[PDB]
Design a protein around this ligand. Structure first.
Ligand SMILES: Cn1cccc(O)c1=S
Lengths: 164, 164
């Protein structure tokens, strides 16, 4: 078993779906587990897809950069969909070394220990509308290294200050 | 011919060199061409390695996000090493769609059409000291898709406003 990689771009180049559509498709097709690591998460469409996955029974684990976590909290509040009262969703924060806030500069989506989207696309309106970005769709052997990185980050994450 | 990928982390996990050391090694070993795409470039050690490569005869092509290009210009000025008077270095800027500045959110180093470093590490002090990040070292088939992306970005780049 090797590794297979396809590239996707925003704007699209030689593929039928946008990166956002592919994100939503990956989440819709999740059967078991979603493991998300994200610097900034304010995209309501992606959030809805994840909430809906969790209501299907999919376990969702989200790790967010601590310094931008308030933007995600703001968005969940706006949607009237507190992540604290969703039984299948765990959210924790990760930070780097301070001096000036050190950050978790990492973005990937890992679905059912089977498929990874890894790249520069952040889950924000600006990446759908404004920014140029790229991602890899990864399957095969290298997916295991993403699982191991997710676990490592998860081990160094904190319960967000808000949550009691 | 397939594709081979190794992961490197900052801080390091199960490898001997830091990402910055690996960047400097890749640049030192460049024989022909360096193609760099970078959101923010203020790291003086990496800049010196690139200037030195260019004095060796290596062709250097750098594409920077337009909105942060001033930070690179500031750094080159501080170092007394204007990129305009270096014959083997071309620098152009890339932007996304405005509304609020659209950005080129892309980071990769492509050396001698042979090896790529692709990941979340930006060429800034903060990524050496403060941030958590990861990259892939890519060789083989997938390198060709990076060459093609570099050319595509290069085709949509502009001469920076400063340069006459
Ligand atoms: C997070 N990430 C991953 C790969 C490439 C990137 O530029 C970034 S920001």
């Amino acid at each position: 078993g090797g590794t297979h990689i396809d590239l996707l771009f925003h704007p699209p180049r030689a593929h039928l779906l946008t990166i956002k559509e592919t994100i939503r498709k990956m989440i819709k097709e999740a059967r078991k587990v979603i493991a998300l690591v994200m610097d900034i998460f304010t995209d309501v469409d992606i959030f809805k897809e994840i909430v809906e996955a969790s209501t299907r029974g999919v376990s969702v684990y989200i790790l967010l950069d601590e310094s931008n976590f308030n933007h995600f909290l703001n968005m969940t509040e706006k949607q009237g969909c507190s992540v604290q009262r969703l039984r299948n969703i765990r959210v924790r924060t990760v930070k780097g070394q301070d001096y000036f806030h050190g950050k978790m500069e990492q973005k990937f989506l890992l679905v059912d220990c089977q498929k990874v989207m890894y790249g520069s696309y952040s889950y924000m309106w600006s990446f759908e509308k404004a920014h140029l970005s790229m991602v890899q769709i990864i399957t095969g052997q290298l997916v295991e290294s993403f699982d191991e990185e997710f676990r490592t980050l998860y081990a160094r994450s904190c319960v967000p200050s808000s949550f009691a």
